[PDB]
């Protein structure tokens, strides 16, 4: 009965579509409208259930450890495998480089995963002791736990941001300096903006094009388009030696 989950190729289709829609929003110059009505673009029914609320870049040794906003934890290891620990303290899911998923438990698991389990526990403990939870102000909706828990598909960092791409399609961009964050959902064609005051607001992209938005959000969306391009192909299709 279990769903196989949205497959990565299907995620890539929606990503390309979001790339195109970001281009369209951005080319519409949304901060230049006669009267910007950003509030009218809000779409509360499309609020994301999941985002990365904490992260640790130990990629020099092991990988990128993270917490999701339901307090589950995961790691994308340097061998492109993922281990996630659900918020019950014991349930695990292991995802191989090719996406093959297996379910296990901390109490009952193949011995082959002992090392990666122990590393995940170290990441968890670190995050819990040291790091602030992003979106700690959002109270979950009833049944949000029924949505498929995603894993971190890919990530990268620039000088100004970290880019986190989840297996449900979402692309999260966290800006280092000012703590502002974007959560782009290519399935809902929506974007959530977390501003410097920690206000969390979810917009329909097509409505940002219709109604406009402030220049800070407009600026972050220009950068987002560039990040999506990089995600889709780290190297340019017009010159594969050149970084997207």
């Amino acid at each position: 009965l279990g769903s196989p989950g949205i497959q990565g190729e299907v995620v890539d289709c929606h990503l390309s579509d979001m790339l195109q829609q970001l281009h369209s929003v951005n080319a519409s110059k949304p901060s230049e409208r006669g009267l910007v009505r950003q509030e009218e673009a809000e779409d509360p029914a499309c609020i994301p259930i999941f985002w990365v609320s904490k992260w640790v870049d130990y990629s020099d040794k092991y990988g990128l450890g993270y917490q999701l906003c339901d307090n589950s934890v995961g790691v994308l290891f340097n061998d492109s495998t993922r281990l996630i620990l659900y918020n019950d303290g014991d349930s695990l899911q292991y995802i191989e480089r090719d996406g093959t998923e297996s379910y296990l438990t901390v109490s009952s698991h193949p011995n082959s995963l002992m090392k990666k389990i122990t590393l995940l526990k170290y990441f968890r403990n670190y995050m819990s002791e040291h790091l602030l939870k992003a979106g700690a102000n959002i109270t979950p909706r009833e049944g949000d736990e029924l949505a498929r828990l995603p894993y971190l598909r890919t990530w990268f960092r620039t000088r100004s941001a970290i880019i986190l791409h989840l297996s449900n399609g979402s692309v999260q961009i966290n800006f280092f300096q000012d703590h502002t964050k974007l959560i782009l959902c290519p399935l809902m064609a929506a974007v959530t903006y977390i501003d410097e005051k920690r206000d969390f607001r979810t917009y329909r992209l097509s409505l940002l094009e219709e109604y406009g938005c402030c220049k800070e959000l407009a600026s972050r969306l220009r950068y987002a388009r560039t990040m999506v391009d990089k995600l889709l192909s780290s190297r340019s299709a017009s010159n594969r030696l050149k970084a997207s």
Binding site: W55, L131, H179
Partner: peptide, 8 residues
Amino acid sequence: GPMTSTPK
């Protein structure tokens, strides 16, 4: 660049 998300 920072090696973690925002600290407590």
